[PDB]
Amino acid sequence: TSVKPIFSRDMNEAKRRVRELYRAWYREVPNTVHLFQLDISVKQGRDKVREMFKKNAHVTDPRVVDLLVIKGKMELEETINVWKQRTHVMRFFHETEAPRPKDFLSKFYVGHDP
Amino acid sequence: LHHAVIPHGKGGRSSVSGIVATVFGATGFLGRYLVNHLGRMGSQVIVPYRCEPYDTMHLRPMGDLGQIIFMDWNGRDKDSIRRAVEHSNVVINLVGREWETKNFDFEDVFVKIPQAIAQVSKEAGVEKFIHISHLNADIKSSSKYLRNKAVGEKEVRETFPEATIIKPADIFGREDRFLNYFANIRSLGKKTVKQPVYIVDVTKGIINAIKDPDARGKTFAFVGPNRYLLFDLVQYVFAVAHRPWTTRDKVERIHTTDRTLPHLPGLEDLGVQATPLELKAIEVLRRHRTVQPAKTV
Amino acid sequence: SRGEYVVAKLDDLINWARRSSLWPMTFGLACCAVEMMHMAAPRYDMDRFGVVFRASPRQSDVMIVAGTLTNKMAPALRKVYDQMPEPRYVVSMGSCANGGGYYHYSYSVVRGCDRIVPVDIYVPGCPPTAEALLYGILQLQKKIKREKRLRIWYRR
Amino acid sequence: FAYDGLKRQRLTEPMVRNEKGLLTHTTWEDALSRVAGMLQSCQGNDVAAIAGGLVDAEALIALKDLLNRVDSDTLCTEEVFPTAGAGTDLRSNYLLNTTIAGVEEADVVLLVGTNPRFEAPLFNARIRKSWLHNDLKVALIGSPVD
Amino acid sequence: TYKYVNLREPSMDMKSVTDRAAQTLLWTELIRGLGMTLSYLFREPATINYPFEKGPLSPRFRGEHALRRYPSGEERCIACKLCEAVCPAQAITIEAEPRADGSRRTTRYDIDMTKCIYCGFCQEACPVDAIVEGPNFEFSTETHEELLYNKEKLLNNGDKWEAEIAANIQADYLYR
Amino acid sequence: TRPTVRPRNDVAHKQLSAFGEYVAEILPKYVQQVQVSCFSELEICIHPDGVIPVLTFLRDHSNAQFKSLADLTAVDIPTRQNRFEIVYNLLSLRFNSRIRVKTYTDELTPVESSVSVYKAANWYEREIWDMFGVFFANHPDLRRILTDYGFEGHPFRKDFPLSGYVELRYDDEVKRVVAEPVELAQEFRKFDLNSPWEAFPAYRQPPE
Amino acid sequence: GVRTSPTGEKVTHTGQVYDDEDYRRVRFVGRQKEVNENFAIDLIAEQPVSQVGSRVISCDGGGGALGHPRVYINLDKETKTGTCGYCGLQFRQQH
Amino acid sequence: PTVKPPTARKFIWTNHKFNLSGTPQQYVPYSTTRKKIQEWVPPSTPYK
Ligand SMILES: NC(=O)C1=CN([C@@H]2O[C@H](COP(=O)(O)OP(=O)(O)OC[C@H]3O[C@@H](n4cnc5c(N)ncnc54)[C@H](OP(=O)(O)O)[C@@H]3O)[C@@H](O)[C@H]2O)C=CC1
Ligand code: SF4
Ligand code: SF4
Ligand code: SF4
Ligand SMILES: [Zn+2]
């Protein structure tokens, strides 16, 4: 159970790195809304950032959150340096995707998926 | 229900929605987004087109292979209408001109052709028929548009008694002639009150009217959530678009107030949240750039 | 009538001038670029048909999608398509541009360029020969020859 | 070879009776509403259920819990097992308790009132294998079948 | 076993220096290049007059697909699905059943011509020479689903091109 | 066995065996296995803490001089708990020879980047990040190289499906290329091709 | 040997034709349903049965290597002909 | 083919057709198989 760390020796350094990545994304959202000339608000983009951070909020392994911070830094570098187009930014907003049936009864009505 | 028209899949491009739709007037502003939202479910869409086939090219990426069937039709040819609708389980009418022409006036476009489509769709056995009138339709209206559209609504209702008739108020979108009219006029300010409605709200309402069996025979009124005076709406259009072809009938329609019909169902009764103008007007008027929002009543 | 005759002759004139002066913008994506270059090479010589070699995308009349369209480049294809002035046509050359081809079941390939842009001529092959691509370009010219823009405008 | 009956005569859509008393196709909403509106008007022995020969344990406990919400205990099968005495309380009086494999370990098999060649053909094949290799003695009380 | 491209020392006598300076000031190699371009100007070009003149093909050419027949009208395909097993792009879709005379025949023989890589592994996997890849290369369509051939289209391509396909196979079957 | 059988090269087999013993005894701290294939290819299977010391040896030692990095490769083998097998193909132009240096990692243990030994690796292990998710510590600019910019998932992992999880299309409502969950109009047809008979008795594994 | 459904649609040699209430006939509106009108089941019935004087006959489809793999057909049944499983030609022992 | 004629067959087209794409005689694809699952037709008499 002795594993080689990526960056963080424990979870507190890991939470420090998660926190600095969230600060950098939070600062980046108005510039991303502006220069990609998006149709969303700055508040809605910061909501999407908060949603994507809370999506991974159950991880207890320091190496897994180190890789999550590394991949978030990579997505941030692809956003700041304008390497993504507008479409890659707007793929976080699943807008053309119709909303899926969530309860039992509508999933029963549409088909066979549990 | 036939086995080939049972819905399958997960509602995507390669799926089967079980909707076989003949959409007349599909090459216009509403037909664009209606065929986009039908073909993204996996619906068979018959597009009868009058125009050049080049002018239908933008409708081709909108669905999977064989899911959009283009065919010729004439408005004064019932045989082409029967040729287009006889396999469909829903027929949507979107035929409209803002202006009258030499070969087609407002009565041909709004009375003769919708009654022809609804009569042929009745005598072909089509289940569902959706017709699009205007919210300001009235026999005693000052404009010829709204008079002929009220007459055509009455004739559609009497020759297809289970027709879903839909009243949009003033549809705004990227290819509208409501915000793009005011943004390119650079006619005056009066006591006219309007609540414009967004085109994706209208399209979601039309597809929910297809899917709802309770929408047969209803008359819906698609309006926006916010009513505006005409003057501050035009000033908001000029403020967002960073600014300091018409006829007198269009002027009579811009100076006709959008009526309030609380006895008619609307977008909330089809499960559609009406999007306000303040989210989408920047998306529409970003093209017109080389803001405090408008006051609601 | 006189007006129908006049708009028919003007349709014939403008269709002649458009199909006899097609300017292509070739997306040289993959192996089909080599065969488009052979369709420009002196044996087949597209330039004698009035089809110039490598016009700029903001003056070209037809976009020849010659190669595999991947997911990473489909917005660039669509942006170049949106920057073309009308009338713009799209020739889909070869199997990967037509339907995904040999990379159809890949995670990273757009299954045919008709999911991205409207397509006029589908030119099949892996690669289609330069003669087959020139066949597709002459079929595109025949499609332009039977256009009815002013006749439909006069009848609307 | 019975899998070709699995693509004939199949029920593919919900059916309800129309005004003429004929079965007509409908949606799942309408059919489940017309069943549940009658189920809400039932209580006790007003509702019962027969299980067929091809029903899995999930649908069996599903319909058992559904009728127990109405307080109905009348849930039946088509095949009669006698409830006299222990009934279905102990499992041992309605099972093949020995095993299918334990036929290889028996030395006398007594068969009562069955034609196991067709009622359970591989159980009969196991009896024949024990007949052939273990010199099993088989007796049958019933009609002299092959 | 190797040679040195560009390892020449230029001569520094006055003759060679004045030769290089006459090259620099009088543009001698530029006139050489103009001479070679002028030399191709007066050549007959290599341009064939398509569509009236055609590019030369061999009998091995791999163009449009065709299901063939016997010299009795019976279709050669006996539904063995070897072509769709070998098909590198999975373009071939085959369904079969015994037909009314009990013969092993297909009810579906589809080839997606927009998946097809035109490599002809199907016609060499075929044990009875049923599927071939014939000589047609001029079959461009205006619609994507016109390139989704079913068994009817492929049997009609066989009936259309059989007089040519049989002669190409007659030329190349001793190499196969 | 003359015409159709590949001729065996015994001289290269003996020489690569001698050099494999040589490397195994110069570097016993990291060398785990040394093997030579029947077609005479030497593999040095090492511990992942010795990526830099072994590769610096073979690049710089006067009896090795493996100056060229031919190829750098990962292999997903999901049955191993260290599922990723990192492969360094090296070329010595001085001794006209090739060597293979193999190591391992799982999803979370980083491998030390070999850009300080071979600059050629700068993209290769970058691709091993993109295709397999193997992180490389102290890489100069480690990011994706082949996938789309918003691409989730490491595709050459063998639990990644052939078609992905998303597919693109243009959508004219939003005027934009969009990503949706993949629906195939024809499913990829999985063929179970493997024969139930043993093909190579020399490769028979001992049973349980 | 093509026939026609009451919808006016040609039945293919498989036997495929769409139903009247099937919407998928709309793909042939203004276009055509391409069928092949040379049914192989109707053409292989038109061949004469080869009367041979042997008990086992071999068929390769003709043409040597341009036919099918060479199979051997037993002709012991005098009730029924011996049909080639590839090309559909059939054989009868002449005694 | 004036010198070496093609071999005549009863199924080879006597009338060669050119490329029919874009015409009413163009190829339209369809599934050449029949229906897989058979549906249950309920009886046309009432159940009383
Ligand atoms: N804001 C709005 O746009 C509102 C619109 N409506 C109604 O919604 C419908 C669609 O609106 P919209 O998209 O804006 O209209 P458009 O003018 O953009 O398009 C209408 C369509 O009808 C077709 N059409 C028009 N006249 C004829 C004719 N004589 N014969 C055959 N086809 C014809 C046109 O075809 P082609 O391309 O060949 O000309 C076009 O495809 C109309 O009925 C309109 O009255 C109602 C309320 C508000
Ligand atoms: S159709 Fe074939 S030859 Fe052409 S670009 Fe695709 S893979 Fe290359
Ligand atoms: S030529 Fe190749 S890709 Fe095309 S159908 Fe034949 S085997 Fe498949
Ligand atoms: S075309 Fe040939 S290989 Fe393919 S199924 Fe038919 S007989 Fe077999
Ligand atoms: Zn034979």
PDB file of C-alpha atoms in Angstrom, chain B residues 23-156:
ATOM      1  CA  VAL B  23     -43.438  20.009 -43.176  1.00  0.00           C
ATOM      2  CA  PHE B  24     -44.782  22.461 -45.745  1.00  0.00           C
ATOM      3  CA  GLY B  25     -42.772  25.648 -45.885  1.00  0.00           C
ATOM      4  CA  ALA B  26     -39.713  23.930 -44.415  1.00  0.00           C
ATOM      5  CA  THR B  27     -37.236  26.144 -46.282  1.00  0.00           C
ATOM      6  CA  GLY B  28     -38.109  29.221 -44.225  1.00  0.00           C
ATOM      7  CA  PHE B  29     -37.163  30.513 -40.801  1.00  0.00           C
ATOM      8  CA  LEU B  30     -39.377  28.179 -38.778  1.00  0.00           C
ATOM      9  CA  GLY B  31     -38.881  25.183 -41.056  1.00  0.00           C
ATOM     10  CA  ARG B  32     -35.113  25.338 -40.575  1.00  0.00           C
ATOM     11  CA  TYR B  33     -35.326  24.875 -36.830  1.00  0.00           C
ATOM     12  CA  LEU B  34     -38.309  22.508 -36.936  1.00  0.00           C
ATOM     13  CA  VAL B  35     -36.520  20.120 -39.302  1.00  0.00           C
ATOM     14  CA  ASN B  36     -33.367  20.476 -37.158  1.00  0.00           C
ATOM     15  CA  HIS B  37     -35.292  19.464 -34.055  1.00  0.00           C
ATOM     16  CA  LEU B  38     -37.197  16.676 -35.835  1.00  0.00           C
ATOM     17  CA  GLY B  39     -34.202  15.113 -37.565  1.00  0.00           C
ATOM     18  CA  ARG B  40     -32.169  15.138 -34.368  1.00  0.00           C
ATOM     19  CA  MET B  41     -34.674  12.640 -32.921  1.00  0.00           C
ATOM     20  CA  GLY B  42     -34.546  10.285 -35.886  1.00  0.00           C
ATOM     21  CA  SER B  43     -37.774  11.384 -37.530  1.00  0.00           C
ATOM     22  CA  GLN B  44     -38.781  10.818 -41.116  1.00  0.00           C
ATOM     23  CA  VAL B  45     -39.134  14.355 -42.464  1.00  0.00           C
ATOM     24  CA  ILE B  46     -40.752  14.931 -45.835  1.00  0.00           C
ATOM     25  CA  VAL B  47     -39.679  18.373 -47.034  1.00  0.00           C
ATOM     26  CA  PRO B  48     -41.808  19.531 -49.945  1.00  0.00           C
ATOM     27  CA  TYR B  49     -39.947  22.405 -51.526  1.00  0.00           C
ATOM     28  CA  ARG B  50     -40.996  24.975 -54.110  1.00  0.00           C
ATOM     29  CA  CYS B  51     -37.664  26.751 -54.478  1.00  0.00           C
ATOM     30  CA  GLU B  52     -34.317  25.918 -56.034  1.00  0.00           C
ATOM     31  CA  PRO B  53     -32.863  22.665 -54.618  1.00  0.00           C
ATOM     32  CA  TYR B  54     -29.692  24.628 -53.779  1.00  0.00           C
ATOM     33  CA  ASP B  55     -31.844  26.644 -51.364  1.00  0.00           C
ATOM     34  CA  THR B  56     -32.651  23.377 -49.539  1.00  0.00           C
ATOM     35  CA  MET B  57     -29.006  22.297 -49.017  1.00  0.00           C
ATOM     36  CA  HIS B  58     -28.914  23.499 -45.396  1.00  0.00           C
ATOM     37  CA  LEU B  59     -31.677  21.017 -44.530  1.00  0.00           C
ATOM     38  CA  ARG B  60     -29.539  18.012 -45.513  1.00  0.00           C
ATOM     39  CA  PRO B  61     -27.149  17.635 -42.504  1.00  0.00           C
ATOM     40  CA  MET B  62     -30.175  17.767 -40.175  1.00  0.00           C
ATOM     41  CA  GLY B  63     -30.766  14.021 -39.981  1.00  0.00           C
ATOM     42  CA  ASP B  64     -29.526  10.522 -40.668  1.00  0.00           C
ATOM     43  CA  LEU B  65     -29.506   8.941 -44.125  1.00  0.00           C
ATOM     44  CA  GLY B  66     -32.881   8.758 -45.815  1.00  0.00           C
ATOM     45  CA  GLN B  67     -34.500  10.697 -42.976  1.00  0.00           C
ATOM     46  CA  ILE B  68     -35.172  13.843 -45.022  1.00  0.00           C
ATOM     47  CA  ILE B  69     -37.070  13.267 -48.276  1.00  0.00           C
ATOM     48  CA  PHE B  70     -37.157  16.285 -50.589  1.00  0.00           C
ATOM     49  CA  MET B  71     -39.924  16.485 -53.139  1.00  0.00           C
ATOM     50  CA  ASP B  72     -41.391  19.079 -55.470  1.00  0.00           C
ATOM     51  CA  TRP B  73     -44.786  20.589 -54.808  1.00  0.00           C
ATOM     52  CA  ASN B  74     -46.929  23.423 -56.095  1.00  0.00           C
ATOM     53  CA  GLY B  75     -49.399  25.265 -53.891  1.00  0.00           C
ATOM     54  CA  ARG B  76     -52.149  25.132 -56.517  1.00  0.00           C
ATOM     55  CA  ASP B  77     -51.581  21.408 -57.181  1.00  0.00           C
ATOM     56  CA  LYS B  78     -53.504  19.097 -54.858  1.00  0.00           C
ATOM     57  CA  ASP B  79     -51.879  16.065 -56.493  1.00  0.00           C
ATOM     58  CA  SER B  80     -48.418  17.103 -55.278  1.00  0.00           C
ATOM     59  CA  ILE B  81     -49.852  17.686 -51.792  1.00  0.00           C
ATOM     60  CA  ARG B  82     -51.350  14.176 -51.773  1.00  0.00           C
ATOM     61  CA  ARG B  83     -48.047  12.899 -53.123  1.00  0.00           C
ATOM     62  CA  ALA B  84     -46.289  14.486 -50.140  1.00  0.00           C
ATOM     63  CA  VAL B  85     -48.644  13.757 -47.211  1.00  0.00           C
ATOM     64  CA  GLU B  86     -49.985  10.263 -47.864  1.00  0.00           C
ATOM     65  CA  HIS B  87     -47.286   8.432 -45.873  1.00  0.00           C
ATOM     66  CA  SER B  88     -47.065  10.930 -43.011  1.00  0.00           C
ATOM     67  CA  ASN B  89     -48.512  10.655 -39.540  1.00  0.00           C
ATOM     68  CA  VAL B  90     -48.187  14.415 -38.980  1.00  0.00           C
ATOM     69  CA  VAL B  91     -48.427  17.378 -41.360  1.00  0.00           C
ATOM     70  CA  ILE B  92     -47.091  20.758 -40.240  1.00  0.00           C
ATOM     71  CA  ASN B  93     -47.971  23.907 -42.178  1.00  0.00           C
ATOM     72  CA  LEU B  94     -45.461  26.764 -42.215  1.00  0.00           C
ATOM     73  CA  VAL B  95     -46.348  28.344 -45.576  1.00  0.00           C
ATOM     74  CA  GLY B  96     -46.167  32.114 -45.301  1.00  0.00           C
ATOM     75  CA  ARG B  97     -45.144  35.304 -47.004  1.00  0.00           C
ATOM     76  CA  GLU B  98     -44.780  38.625 -45.227  1.00  0.00           C
ATOM     77  CA  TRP B  99     -45.527  40.350 -48.544  1.00  0.00           C
ATOM     78  CA  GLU B 100     -47.903  39.544 -51.367  1.00  0.00           C
ATOM     79  CA  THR B 101     -46.540  38.741 -54.815  1.00  0.00           C
ATOM     80  CA  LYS B 102     -47.791  38.802 -58.383  1.00  0.00           C
ATOM     81  CA  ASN B 103     -48.595  35.081 -58.385  1.00  0.00           C
ATOM     82  CA  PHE B 104     -49.460  34.654 -54.689  1.00  0.00           C
ATOM     83  CA  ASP B 105     -51.371  37.169 -52.582  1.00  0.00           C
ATOM     84  CA  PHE B 106     -52.228  36.811 -48.883  1.00  0.00           C
ATOM     85  CA  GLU B 107     -55.363  34.811 -49.699  1.00  0.00           C
ATOM     86  CA  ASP B 108     -53.486  32.240 -51.783  1.00  0.00           C
ATOM     87  CA  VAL B 109     -50.764  31.866 -49.152  1.00  0.00           C
ATOM     88  CA  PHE B 110     -52.969  31.951 -46.028  1.00  0.00           C
ATOM     89  CA  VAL B 111     -56.432  30.726 -47.084  1.00  0.00           C
ATOM     90  CA  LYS B 112     -56.174  28.663 -50.267  1.00  0.00           C
ATOM     91  CA  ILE B 113     -52.973  26.673 -49.646  1.00  0.00           C
ATOM     92  CA  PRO B 114     -53.651  25.872 -45.926  1.00  0.00           C
ATOM     93  CA  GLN B 115     -57.197  24.759 -46.758  1.00  0.00           C
ATOM     94  CA  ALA B 116     -55.800  22.654 -49.612  1.00  0.00           C
ATOM     95  CA  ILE B 117     -53.173  21.077 -47.340  1.00  0.00           C
ATOM     96  CA  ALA B 118     -55.688  20.418 -44.559  1.00  0.00           C
ATOM     97  CA  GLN B 119     -58.340  19.030 -46.937  1.00  0.00           C
ATOM     98  CA  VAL B 120     -55.858  16.691 -48.614  1.00  0.00           C
ATOM     99  CA  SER B 121     -54.415  15.699 -45.227  1.00  0.00           C
ATOM    100  CA  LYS B 122     -57.937  14.877 -44.059  1.00  0.00           C
ATOM    101  CA  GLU B 123     -58.700  12.814 -47.165  1.00  0.00           C
ATOM    102  CA  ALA B 124     -55.349  10.997 -46.975  1.00  0.00           C
ATOM    103  CA  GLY B 125     -55.900   9.773 -43.422  1.00  0.00           C
ATOM    104  CA  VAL B 126     -53.196  11.802 -41.686  1.00  0.00           C
ATOM    105  CA  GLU B 127     -53.528  11.665 -37.900  1.00  0.00           C
ATOM    106  CA  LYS B 128     -52.073  14.991 -36.792  1.00  0.00           C
ATOM    107  CA  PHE B 129     -52.179  18.393 -38.463  1.00  0.00           C
ATOM    108  CA  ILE B 130     -50.467  21.482 -37.067  1.00  0.00           C
ATOM    109  CA  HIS B 131     -51.245  24.896 -38.536  1.00  0.00           C
ATOM    110  CA  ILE B 132     -49.494  28.166 -37.697  1.00  0.00           C
ATOM    111  CA  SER B 133     -51.627  31.301 -37.522  1.00  0.00           C
ATOM    112  CA  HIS B 134     -50.624  34.620 -35.913  1.00  0.00           C
ATOM    113  CA  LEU B 135     -51.564  35.835 -32.431  1.00  0.00           C
ATOM    114  CA  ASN B 136     -52.974  39.079 -33.853  1.00  0.00           C
ATOM    115  CA  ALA B 137     -55.243  37.294 -36.344  1.00  0.00           C
ATOM    116  CA  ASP B 138     -58.622  39.002 -36.629  1.00  0.00           C
ATOM    117  CA  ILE B 139     -61.263  39.551 -39.285  1.00  0.00           C
ATOM    118  CA  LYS B 140     -61.509  43.221 -38.277  1.00  0.00           C
ATOM    119  CA  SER B 141     -57.756  43.823 -38.389  1.00  0.00           C
ATOM    120  CA  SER B 142     -56.377  46.744 -40.368  1.00  0.00           C
ATOM    121  CA  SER B 143     -53.709  44.640 -42.097  1.00  0.00           C
ATOM    122  CA  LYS B 144     -54.472  42.196 -44.890  1.00  0.00           C
ATOM    123  CA  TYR B 145     -52.018  39.665 -43.411  1.00  0.00           C
ATOM    124  CA  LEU B 146     -53.973  39.232 -40.187  1.00  0.00           C
ATOM    125  CA  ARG B 147     -57.352  39.226 -41.968  1.00  0.00           C
ATOM    126  CA  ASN B 148     -56.410  36.469 -44.401  1.00  0.00           C
ATOM    127  CA  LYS B 149     -54.661  34.558 -41.643  1.00  0.00           C
ATOM    128  CA  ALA B 150     -57.790  34.668 -39.457  1.00  0.00           C
ATOM    129  CA  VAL B 151     -59.856  33.460 -42.440  1.00  0.00           C
ATOM    130  CA  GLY B 152     -57.356  30.667 -43.077  1.00  0.00           C
ATOM    131  CA  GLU B 153     -57.360  29.672 -39.411  1.00  0.00           C
ATOM    132  CA  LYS B 154     -61.158  29.405 -39.538  1.00  0.00           C
ATOM    133  CA  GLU B 155     -61.058  27.311 -42.713  1.00  0.00           C
ATOM    134  CA  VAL B 156     -58.314  25.032 -41.332  1.00  0.00           C
TER     135      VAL B 156
END
